[PDB]
Short mmCIF file of all heavy atoms in Angstrom, two decimals:
data_model
loop_
_atom_site.label_atom_id
_atom_site.label_comp_id
_atom_site.label_asym_id
_atom_site.label_seq_id
_atom_site.Cartn_x
_atom_site.Cartn_y
_atom_site.Cartn_z
N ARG A 316 0.81 -1.23 0.00
CA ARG A 316 0.00 0.00 0.00
C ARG A 316 0.84 1.27 0.00
O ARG A 316 0.40 2.31 0.50
CB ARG A 316 -0.99 0.03 1.17
CG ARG A 316 -1.85 -1.20 1.30
CD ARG A 316 -2.81 -1.06 2.46
NE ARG A 316 -3.82 -0.04 2.20
CZ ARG A 316 -5.04 -0.31 1.76
NH1 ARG A 316 -5.41 -1.56 1.55
NH2 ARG A 316 -5.91 0.68 1.55
N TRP A 317 2.04 1.22 -0.57
CA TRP A 317 2.87 2.42 -0.64
C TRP A 317 2.40 3.40 -1.70
O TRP A 317 2.81 4.56 -1.68
CB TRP A 317 4.33 2.04 -0.91
CG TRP A 317 5.01 1.46 0.28
CD1 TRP A 317 4.94 0.17 0.70
CD2 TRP A 317 5.88 2.14 1.19
NE1 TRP A 317 5.71 0.00 1.83
CE2 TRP A 317 6.30 1.19 2.15
CE3 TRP A 317 6.35 3.45 1.29
CZ2 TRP A 317 7.16 1.52 3.19
CZ3 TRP A 317 7.21 3.77 2.33
CH2 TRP A 317 7.60 2.81 3.26
N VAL A 318 1.54 2.96 -2.62
CA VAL A 318 1.09 3.81 -3.72
C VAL A 318 -0.41 4.04 -3.51
O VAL A 318 -1.19 4.07 -4.47
CB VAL A 318 1.40 3.17 -5.09
CG1 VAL A 318 1.46 4.23 -6.22
CG2 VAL A 318 2.69 2.36 -5.04
N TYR A 319 -0.83 4.13 -2.25
CA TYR A 319 -2.20 4.52 -1.94
C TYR A 319 -2.46 5.94 -2.46
O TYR A 319 -1.60 6.82 -2.30
CB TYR A 319 -2.43 4.45 -0.43
CG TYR A 319 -3.85 4.69 0.02
CD1 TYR A 319 -4.78 3.66 0.00
CD2 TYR A 319 -4.26 5.94 0.48
CE1 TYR A 319 -6.09 3.87 0.41
CE2 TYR A 319 -5.56 6.16 0.89
CZ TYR A 319 -6.47 5.12 0.86
OH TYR A 319 -7.76 5.34 1.27
N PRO A 320 -3.62 6.21 -3.09
CA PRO A 320 -4.88 5.47 -3.22
C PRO A 320 -4.92 4.35 -4.26
O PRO A 320 -5.92 3.63 -4.29
CB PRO A 320 -5.89 6.56 -3.61
CG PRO A 320 -5.11 7.87 -3.60
CD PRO A 320 -3.70 7.49 -3.79
N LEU A 321 -3.90 4.22 -5.10
CA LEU A 321 -3.91 3.18 -6.12
C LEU A 321 -3.68 1.83 -5.45
O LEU A 321 -2.54 1.42 -5.23
CB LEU A 321 -2.85 3.45 -7.20
CG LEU A 321 -3.28 4.26 -8.43
CD1 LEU A 321 -3.46 5.74 -8.10
CD2 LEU A 321 -2.27 4.09 -9.55
N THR A 322 -4.77 1.14 -5.13
CA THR A 322 -4.79 -0.03 -4.28
C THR A 322 -5.55 -1.14 -5.00
O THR A 322 -6.51 -0.85 -5.71
CB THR A 322 -5.47 0.30 -2.94
OG1 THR A 322 -5.14 1.64 -2.57
CG2 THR A 322 -4.99 -0.61 -1.83
N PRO A 323 -5.11 -2.40 -4.87
CA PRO A 323 -5.82 -3.49 -5.58
C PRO A 323 -7.25 -3.72 -5.13
O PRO A 323 -8.11 -4.02 -5.98
CB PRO A 323 -4.94 -4.71 -5.30
CG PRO A 323 -3.58 -4.15 -5.13
CD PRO A 323 -3.77 -2.83 -4.44
N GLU A 324 -7.56 -3.61 -3.84
CA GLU A 324 -8.94 -3.78 -3.42
C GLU A 324 -9.78 -2.52 -3.65
O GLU A 324 -11.01 -2.59 -3.58
CB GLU A 324 -9.02 -4.19 -1.95
CG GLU A 324 -9.06 -3.03 -0.97
CD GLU A 324 -7.69 -2.70 -0.43
OE1 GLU A 324 -6.71 -3.29 -0.92
OE2 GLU A 324 -7.59 -1.84 0.47
N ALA A 325 -9.14 -1.38 -3.93
CA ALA A 325 -9.88 -0.17 -4.22
C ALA A 325 -10.57 -0.24 -5.58
O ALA A 325 -11.62 0.38 -5.77
CB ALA A 325 -8.96 1.05 -4.17
N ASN A 326 -9.99 -1.00 -6.52
CA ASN A 326 -10.51 -1.26 -7.86
C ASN A 326 -10.73 0.05 -8.63
O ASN A 326 -11.85 0.46 -8.94
CB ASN A 326 -11.80 -2.09 -7.81
CG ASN A 326 -12.05 -2.86 -9.10
OD1 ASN A 326 -11.11 -3.28 -9.77
ND2 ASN A 326 -13.32 -3.05 -9.44
N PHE A 327 -9.60 0.72 -8.90
CA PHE A 327 -9.63 2.01 -9.58
C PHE A 327 -10.11 1.89 -11.02
O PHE A 327 -10.69 2.84 -11.57
CB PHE A 327 -8.26 2.69 -9.51
CG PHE A 327 -7.11 1.80 -9.90
CD1 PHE A 327 -6.72 1.67 -11.23
CD2 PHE A 327 -6.38 1.11 -8.93
CE1 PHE A 327 -5.66 0.86 -11.59
CE2 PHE A 327 -5.32 0.30 -9.29
CZ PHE A 327 -4.96 0.18 -10.62
N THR A 328 -9.87 0.75 -11.65
CA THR A 328 -10.47 0.45 -12.94
C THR A 328 -11.75 -0.37 -12.73
O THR A 328 -11.87 -1.14 -11.77
CB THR A 328 -9.49 -0.29 -13.86
OG1 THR A 328 -10.11 -0.54 -15.13
CG2 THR A 328 -9.00 -1.59 -13.24
N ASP A 329 -12.72 -0.16 -13.61
CA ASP A 329 -14.03 -0.80 -13.47
C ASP A 329 -13.97 -2.16 -14.14
O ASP A 329 -14.10 -2.28 -15.37
CB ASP A 329 -15.12 0.08 -14.07
CG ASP A 329 -15.26 1.41 -13.35
OD1 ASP A 329 -14.52 1.64 -12.37
OD2 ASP A 329 -16.12 2.22 -13.76
N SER A 330 -13.78 -3.20 -13.34
CA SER A 330 -13.74 -4.57 -13.83
C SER A 330 -14.18 -5.50 -12.71
O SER A 330 -13.70 -5.38 -11.58
CB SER A 330 -12.35 -4.95 -14.33
OG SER A 330 -11.54 -5.43 -13.27
N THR A 331 -15.08 -6.43 -13.03
CA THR A 331 -15.62 -7.32 -12.01
C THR A 331 -14.66 -8.44 -11.65
O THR A 331 -14.80 -9.03 -10.57
CB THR A 331 -16.95 -7.92 -12.48
OG1 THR A 331 -16.69 -8.96 -13.44
CG2 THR A 331 -17.82 -6.85 -13.12
N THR A 332 -13.69 -8.74 -12.51
CA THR A 332 -12.74 -9.82 -12.27
C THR A 332 -11.58 -9.41 -11.38
O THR A 332 -10.73 -10.25 -11.07
CB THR A 332 -12.20 -10.35 -13.60
OG1 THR A 332 -11.41 -11.52 -13.36
CG2 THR A 332 -11.34 -9.29 -14.28
N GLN A 333 -11.53 -8.15 -10.95
CA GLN A 333 -10.46 -7.66 -10.09
C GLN A 333 -10.98 -7.07 -8.78
O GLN A 333 -10.22 -6.40 -8.07
CB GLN A 333 -9.61 -6.62 -10.82
CG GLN A 333 -8.92 -7.16 -12.06
CD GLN A 333 -8.33 -6.06 -12.93
OE1 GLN A 333 -8.63 -4.88 -12.73
NE2 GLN A 333 -7.50 -6.44 -13.89
N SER A 334 -12.25 -7.29 -8.45
CA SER A 334 -12.78 -6.83 -7.17
C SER A 334 -12.22 -7.69 -6.05
O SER A 334 -12.17 -8.92 -6.15
CB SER A 334 -14.30 -6.88 -7.17
OG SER A 334 -14.78 -8.17 -6.86
N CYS A 335 -11.80 -7.05 -4.96
CA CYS A 335 -11.05 -7.73 -3.92
C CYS A 335 -11.49 -7.23 -2.55
O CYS A 335 -12.19 -6.22 -2.43
CB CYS A 335 -9.55 -7.52 -4.13
SG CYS A 335 -8.51 -8.37 -2.96
N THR A 336 -11.06 -7.94 -1.51
CA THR A 336 -11.24 -7.50 -0.13
C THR A 336 -9.91 -7.57 0.61
O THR A 336 -9.02 -8.37 0.26
CB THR A 336 -12.32 -8.31 0.61
OG1 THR A 336 -12.54 -7.74 1.91
CG2 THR A 336 -11.93 -9.77 0.76
N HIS A 337 -9.77 -6.72 1.62
CA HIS A 337 -8.51 -6.52 2.33
C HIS A 337 -8.68 -6.95 3.78
O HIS A 337 -9.36 -6.28 4.56
CB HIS A 337 -8.08 -5.06 2.24
CG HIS A 337 -6.95 -4.70 3.16
ND1 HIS A 337 -5.63 -4.93 2.84
CD2 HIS A 337 -6.94 -4.12 4.38
CE1 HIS A 337 -4.85 -4.52 3.82
NE2 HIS A 337 -5.63 -4.02 4.77
N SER A 338 -8.05 -8.07 4.15
CA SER A 338 -8.02 -8.54 5.52
C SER A 338 -6.77 -7.98 6.21
O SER A 338 -6.10 -7.08 5.70
CB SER A 338 -8.06 -10.06 5.56
OG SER A 338 -9.35 -10.54 5.20
N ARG A 339 -6.45 -8.51 7.39
CA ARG A 339 -5.28 -8.08 8.13
C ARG A 339 -4.00 -8.60 7.47
O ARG A 339 -4.03 -9.52 6.65
CB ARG A 339 -5.35 -8.55 9.58
CG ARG A 339 -6.75 -8.48 10.18
CD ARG A 339 -6.74 -8.97 11.61
NE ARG A 339 -5.89 -8.16 12.47
CZ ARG A 339 -6.34 -7.23 13.31
NH1 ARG A 339 -7.64 -7.01 13.41
NH2 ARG A 339 -5.48 -6.54 14.05
N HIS A 340 -2.88 -7.98 7.85
CA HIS A 340 -1.52 -8.29 7.36
C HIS A 340 -1.41 -8.16 5.84
O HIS A 340 -0.64 -8.90 5.22
CB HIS A 340 -1.05 -9.67 7.81
CG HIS A 340 -1.13 -9.88 9.29
ND1 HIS A 340 -1.33 -11.13 9.86
CD2 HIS A 340 -1.02 -9.02 10.33
CE1 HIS A 340 -1.35 -11.01 11.17
NE2 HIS A 340 -1.16 -9.74 11.48
N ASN A 341 -2.17 -7.21 5.27
CA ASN A 341 -2.20 -6.92 3.83
C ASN A 341 -2.56 -8.15 3.00
O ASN A 341 -2.01 -8.38 1.92
CB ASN A 341 -0.89 -6.30 3.34
CG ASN A 341 -0.62 -4.95 3.96
OD1 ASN A 341 -1.54 -4.19 4.25
ND2 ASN A 341 0.65 -4.64 4.18
N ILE A 342 -3.50 -8.96 3.50
CA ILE A 342 -3.98 -10.12 2.77
C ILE A 342 -5.11 -9.68 1.85
O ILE A 342 -6.11 -9.12 2.30
CB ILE A 342 -4.46 -11.22 3.73
CG1 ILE A 342 -3.27 -11.86 4.44
CG2 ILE A 342 -5.25 -12.29 2.99
CD1 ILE A 342 -3.66 -12.76 5.59
N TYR A 343 -4.93 -9.90 0.55
CA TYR A 343 -5.90 -9.50 -0.46
C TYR A 343 -6.58 -10.76 -0.99
O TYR A 343 -5.91 -11.64 -1.55
CB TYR A 343 -5.23 -8.72 -1.58
CG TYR A 343 -4.43 -7.54 -1.10
CD1 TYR A 343 -3.04 -7.57 -1.12
CD2 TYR A 343 -5.06 -6.40 -0.63
CE1 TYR A 343 -2.30 -6.48 -0.69
CE2 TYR A 343 -4.33 -5.31 -0.19
CZ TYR A 343 -2.95 -5.36 -0.22
OH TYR A 343 -2.22 -4.28 0.21
N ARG A 344 -7.90 -10.84 -0.83
CA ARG A 344 -8.65 -12.02 -1.23
C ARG A 344 -9.69 -11.65 -2.28
O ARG A 344 -10.50 -10.74 -2.06
CB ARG A 344 -9.32 -12.68 -0.03
CG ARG A 344 -10.12 -13.92 -0.38
CD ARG A 344 -10.42 -14.76 0.86
NE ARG A 344 -11.26 -15.91 0.54
CZ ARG A 344 -11.52 -16.90 1.39
NH1 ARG A 344 -11.00 -16.88 2.61
NH2 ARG A 344 -12.30 -17.90 1.02
N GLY A 345 -9.66 -12.35 -3.41
CA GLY A 345 -10.65 -12.15 -4.44
C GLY A 345 -11.89 -12.99 -4.19
O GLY A 345 -12.06 -13.59 -3.13
N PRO A 346 -12.80 -13.02 -5.16
CA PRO A 346 -13.98 -13.88 -5.04
C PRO A 346 -13.72 -15.30 -5.54
O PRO A 346 -12.95 -15.52 -6.47
CB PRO A 346 -15.02 -13.17 -5.92
CG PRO A 346 -14.20 -12.50 -6.97
CD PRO A 346 -12.88 -12.14 -6.34
N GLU A 347 -14.39 -16.24 -4.86
CA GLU A 347 -14.39 -17.67 -5.20
C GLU A 347 -12.98 -18.27 -5.18
O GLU A 347 -12.45 -18.72 -6.20
CB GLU A 347 -15.09 -17.93 -6.54
N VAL A 348 -12.37 -18.25 -4.00
CA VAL A 348 -11.03 -18.81 -3.83
C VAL A 348 -11.08 -20.26 -3.36
O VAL A 348 -10.31 -21.09 -3.85
CB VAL A 348 -10.22 -17.93 -2.85
CG1 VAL A 348 -8.76 -18.33 -2.86
CG2 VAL A 348 -10.37 -16.46 -3.22
N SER A 349 -12.00 -20.56 -2.44
CA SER A 349 -12.19 -21.88 -1.81
C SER A 349 -10.89 -22.36 -1.16
O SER A 349 -10.26 -23.33 -1.59
CB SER A 349 -12.74 -22.92 -2.81
OG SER A 349 -11.79 -23.23 -3.82
N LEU A 350 -10.51 -21.64 -0.11
CA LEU A 350 -9.27 -21.90 0.60
C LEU A 350 -9.37 -23.21 1.38
O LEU A 350 -10.43 -23.58 1.89
CB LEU A 350 -8.96 -20.75 1.55
CG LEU A 350 -7.54 -20.64 2.10
CD1 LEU A 350 -6.57 -20.29 0.98
CD2 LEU A 350 -7.46 -19.61 3.22
N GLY A 351 -8.24 -23.92 1.46
CA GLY A 351 -8.19 -25.23 2.06
C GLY A 351 -7.68 -25.22 3.50
O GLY A 351 -7.27 -24.20 4.04
N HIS A 352 -7.72 -26.40 4.11
CA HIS A 352 -7.30 -26.56 5.49
C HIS A 352 -5.78 -26.58 5.59
O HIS A 352 -5.09 -27.19 4.77
CB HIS A 352 -7.87 -27.85 6.08
CG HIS A 352 -9.36 -27.91 6.07
ND1 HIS A 352 -10.13 -27.48 7.13
CD2 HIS A 352 -10.24 -28.35 5.13
CE1 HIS A 352 -11.41 -27.65 6.85
NE2 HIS A 352 -11.50 -28.18 5.64
N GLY A 353 -5.25 -25.90 6.60
CA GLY A 353 -3.83 -25.87 6.85
C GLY A 353 -3.04 -24.88 6.03
O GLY A 353 -1.83 -24.75 6.24
#
């Protein structure tokens, strides 16, 4: 996030395939990941 406001979860370009969410420790998660155990 050194180039804020240009942020991946901010989605400065209008595209549905790049919409993201920002958890702790700068973890960026997209839609439909289906994360596994461990």
Side-chain angles (χ1 to χ4, degrees), residues 316-346 348-353:
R316 308 181 69 98
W317 286 82
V318 203
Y319 186 83
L321 269 73
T322 324
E324 88 265 6
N326 204 32
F327 48 87
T328 181
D329 297 0
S330 87
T331 77
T332 188
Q333 298 168 348
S334 83
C335 183
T336 186
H337 169 83
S338 289
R339 321 180 62 102
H340 306 151
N341 296 327
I342 289 169
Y343 306 108
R344 180 163 177 170
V348 191
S349 68
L350 197 68
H352 300 268

